[model samples]
Every structure is written in C-alpha cells, then in structure tokens.
Target: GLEQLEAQTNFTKRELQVLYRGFKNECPSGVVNEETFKQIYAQFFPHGDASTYAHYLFNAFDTTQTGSVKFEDFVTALSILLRGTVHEKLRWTFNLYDINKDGYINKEEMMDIVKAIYDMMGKYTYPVLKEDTPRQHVDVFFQKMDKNKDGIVTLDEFLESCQEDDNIMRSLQLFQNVMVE
Candidate 1:
C-alpha cells in the first residue's frame, strides 16, 4: 500500500537532503556511512536487519550526510519511522494517517492511529476522546518518544531515546509501540 498512499518513486535528493540535515543536527558528531550504519543500526534495532530496513531509516533521517536529526526533521523522520514501510501490510502507514499535515503526529493523529489499530484488530470504539477530558497523556508519550529535542526520530534515536535503559525495555517498548515493527 506504499504505492496507494502515494506514488512510490525514487528517493529524491530533496527528501534525502531533508533527512540528512535532520540527522546531523541531532548527531553533531557527523555522519555514519554504510558500514558504520550497519553497526549502529544493529546496535539500534538489534533484531531487525540492516540490509532490509536500516537503509530506509538511515536515508530517512540522515539528511545532509552529517548524521543525527533536528526537531522538525526528527518529527518528520519519526513520522516515517513509526509509519513507513518495507513489505505488504506495513508501508507508509504513518504518512497515510498524517491528516493534519503538521509533520509530526500530535494527539489528534495519535488518537486516529490508535483508533485505526483498534479497527484493524476488529474491535469497537467503546470510548472516544470526550469534551473536557485530558489528551495530555498521548501527547506526552509522543513527546517522550521524540526526546532528542529535534522533532523527528531516526531508528537509533527512537530505539535508544532512553539511553542506558535496558536494551530489552527499549526494544520491547519500540516493538510494542512501533506499529510498523
């Protein structure tokens, strides 16, 4: 459905540039190449394959070849990372539901996505966000996930956002929250 979401075309330099610049801002230490990419990605998403999915992550957030991600870039990249694709059912879901066009999925988008998940699971929406209730929790989690202060989140950034905090916890949280994963 990547094609359905949008015309799947070549990864344009412009898009790559956006990602590259974003990455560099968050990772001021400079770029990581294909080899280092594999190592870092392996460390980042251990159970995932570098050849298979890491390349997308790398190119998605490594805008400008300088490594790391800035805020808006982080938000955009996180949008993709959390919702982009590799295969049959999981391609570009994030982009598909980014109805607000704000580059980042705020509480509204999060609510929509969670609703979609419930729909996919063939469940009914028992409760919707009501008036006078707080939507802060959803926004807070999204903010926490994107802790790098840049707005987007690369695979590594998302994975190790809470650094030195149990790899398994990180991995599990990602696996649990990352719909694409």
Candidate 2:
C-alpha cells in the first residue's frame, strides 16, 4: 500500500481521499453535510477524529447520495489543492512519469517516475533524498524489469520484473516450500 502511495504521480492517500470527497460533496443534487460525512466516515475511517476530520472527510459523499464523484468537482478541488509553484514541480514530475497517461501509476512507471523526480525535483519533494537510497534502488530495479519495450505496463510486465513479486516467485516458492517440508 505504501509503495502504491509512492507511485501516484502527485498524491498522498489522505489527499486522494480528500479529493474523492470533494468531488462527491459538490454533486449537483447532492447535499453533503454533517450527517453525510458522519455516515461515510464511520465506515471509511473508524479511527479518525470525526470532529476535526469532518471538513476533509466530506469530500467523499455526493450530497445527492450518488455513487461516484463528478469529474468536474474533483478537478476543481484538485486545482485548489495543487495550485502554486510547488504544484508546478509536482506536475512536472507527474507528466514525466505518467508514461501511459492513464492518470494512475503501475509498478513499471513507479520507479523511473520517482527517479526522474529525485533527479530533478528531489530537493523540493524529498528533503533528505541522498539518504533515500532504498527508494532510489527499488525504482531503478523496477525500471530494469519493464523489459517489454512498451510504455504501458501491465501486471504481467510487473510479475516478470521481480522474483519477489507475490504473483510470481512467491506463489512458486510457497508450492516448493510445502513440497520440501
């Protein structure tokens, strides 16, 4: 999950959820308010402080009880959250690594995409980048595995890249380990 968070072009899990909620709240027919937030938050974040988190949490509920966040509202909230010079840096990193432009990052693009950011914008995004060798190495290793020569990476490409991958080596190892035992 942490790796997945790290992979997104420019979002944290918390922020993403906030964006999701914002999209929901502004839905034309929706009436996202205290009651709406409380209901959803009880299920989505049982551990959070409902009082303080209400404003942030309301972003997820479509006041109309619609199932999904409208794209327009989502973009509007996103613009506000990511606006500024810092956002420009993040956008640059996002564009460089979103090789497929699907608005989501998969394993293949994760490492190289992060690498580009580290190389170009590391000081700004990651203050201690020189000490973040593990992240850098992992991304480099990921780049090596994306061998299909295609920009868009599928789960198959990811499985082929690392022996430690659960869908590949881990599954094979479990079977072998059982037989050996």
Candidate 3:
C-alpha cells in the first residue's frame, strides 16, 4: 500500500500515515474530485477565476485518467515540487505545461496556460488583460523552448532550454516556490 508510495515520494512512513489521515479525513472516499480540487486552488488564489488554471492542474494530477485525483498522484507531484532536485522540478514543470500529455507542448498549449496565468493576475489588479497578450507572450516562450524548430517543444527540448530560463519557470512553478493553478 503506502510502502510503494514511500518508494517514489519524499514522505516517511509516519508522515505518510499522518498525511493519509488528513487526506482521508478530508474526503472519506480517499480521492478528490475536480471541483474540490479547484476549490482549494480558490482558497490559495482568490484574486481571479482560478477555474481554468485549476482545471489544468487537476488534469496534470489526474494521472489515472479517471476524472479524479488519487493520493498517489497528488503526493508524488508534491514530493518532487517540495523535495525533489532542480532537474526533477524542471521535469515536472515540463510535465505541467504539456497540456495534452502528447510528449510535447505546442503554441496553443503554451498560449492557453499563459492566458490562464494572465487570467489570475489581471482580473484582480484591474489591468484588463489586453487581448492577444497571451498569444504574443507565448511566442517568446514557444520560440525559446522549441529547439528543433519543428513547431513542437518536446520533453528533452523543454528541459535543456528551460533549465536556465527561470522567469517562465518561476512564474509557472510559482505554485511551488511561492504558492497554485
């Protein structure tokens, strides 16, 4: 049961026990629905409609492809985000922005997440996210990340290019270094 979980994650035996109790207590069925997933995101980021970004996160965490996020999925990602190394975190960050899980990130994928981020930032600050802002923004990221000039940013390409590009890394993984979705 938890033994395998301990193998892949950073938590200890006792810590996993405690966290499981907390996770189980929160949702007795031992899994979290997508709605509650976004609710917690709202708790962390009330500045905007966190729905879209939260939805993306749940998709990333929903490793089961069964519509709900299991404890293994959540804890594993948290393990890397919290206790994993730079490459590990960078790999997960790549896993994150790859929306379709098709082994690469296309411009549309980049744009949508960018829009999602802008959604969180502008709605609260009253800056009024200029239309096409995310489109233009994604060009810079897509340009830098697409090393093969093949219009698709693969995982290998993502890591090397994103290894040093901490601005996009920081903003995207702000959910980890600073704080969600």
Candidate 4:
C-alpha cells in the first residue's frame, strides 16, 4: 500500500503512513463515502451549498464510480489538491465545475454552481451582488471561457482562458501557497 501510494503521490512513506492512519481512523472501511466527504467539506466551506461542490468533487475522486473514494484515491486527491501543479489544480477545478460529468460544461451547469455559491453567501458579501447576480457573473465567465462562442466550455478552454486572467492566475498561486503552509 505504501509503495503504491509512493507511485501515486509525492508523499514520503512516513508521511503516507501518517495520512493513512488518520484516514483509516476516520473511515475504517477503507473508503470515504460520498456523504461523509460532503460533511467534511461542509466543515471547511460552510458558507455555500458546499454539499453540491463536495458532491462533484467526490465524483471526481471516485473515478471508478464505486460510489466511494478508496484510501489510495483519497490520498491521491489530497496530494493533488494540496501540492499539485497549477495546471493540475486548474484541471481539478474544471472537473468540479463540470457537475454533470459530461466532459463539457454548459451554461446551466455553471449557473447551478454559481447560484449555489450565491446562496451560500447569504445575499451579503463584500461589494454585494445586487447589481450583478450570480447568473450574470457566470455568463461573463462563460463568455471568456467559451472562446469559440459554442456555449460550452471544455477543460482546455477553461485552463487556457483562466491562465490569461491575471487575477485567476494569482488566485491559483495564492491557493497553492496557502495549501503549502
């Protein structure tokens, strides 16, 4: 198991053992179920419909469609989230936004997550969103991401477009820095 983890992640054997111990203690059955994963996300990002994001994230991790994330899968996901390259992290973010798991993100899918974020923010946040609702904001994002004007966003488009946005690039680096700490 440790050797397999080494092949999958950059974590040292001792580090893997520590992480595995915690994971095993929390989920002795060797898999982290979807609902449990959602609750864990809820604890961290309590403001929005974190469950929705968590649901999609869990699906991404459960690549085998096993309905649960195994220890290896869980650790690999953590490694990516906490230590992966910018492109890898961006791809993971794209996977979360592609809620339907259809490999392409449409306007509706983007709005669904956007609305969930608005709902989580409880109608009150810095600068407020009165002049621009979540849907409108997502429409702007689609305009930028869907460069082909095809009304759909592929992973390539998302990564390419986001990379050109200074704010987004900075945010990604900031997120990585925070995770490193």
- lDDT tens string, model 2, 9-34? 35665666665576456444534455
TM-scores vs. true structure, each candidate:
0.27, 0.23, 0.86, 0.82
Candidate with better lDDT, 1 vs 3: 3
Say which prediction, candidate 3 or candidate 4, comes out ahead on lDDT: 3
| Model 2 deviation from the true structure expressed as Cα RMSD, one decimal place | 16.9
Question: Could you tell me how far off, in angstroms, the CA of residue 16 lies in candidate 2 after the best superposition?
Answer: 20
| Top TM-score hit | 3
Best by lDDT: 3
- Evaluation by lDDT, superior candidate among 2 and 3: 3
Cα deviation at 168, candidate 2, in Å, is 10
Q: Give the TM-score of candidate 4.
A: 0.82
Q: Which pairs in model 2 have colliding backbones?
A: 21-59, 21-60, 22-59, 30-63, 30-64, 31-63, 32-63
User: Global CA lDDT of candidate 3, please?
Assistant: 0.76
- Which lDDT tens digits does candidate 1 get at residues 19-57? 557567645555456555545455534333434344444
Give lDDT per model, in order.
Answer: 0.42, 0.41, 0.76, 0.72
lDDT per residue (tens digit) for residues 1-181 in model 4:
7897788897889999898898888887878999888776666545556676566667878978899798888778778878888788787777777877789999998887667656645555334333258777777778877989999999888888878886544422332233235
Residue-level lDDT of model 3, residues 11-44, one tens digit each, is 8988888878878887788899999888877666
Pairs that collide, model 4: 48-120
Off by over 4 Å in 4: 124-132, 169-181
Q: List the residue pairs that clash in candidate 3.
A: 175-179
Worst 10 residues of 4 by lDDT: 171-180
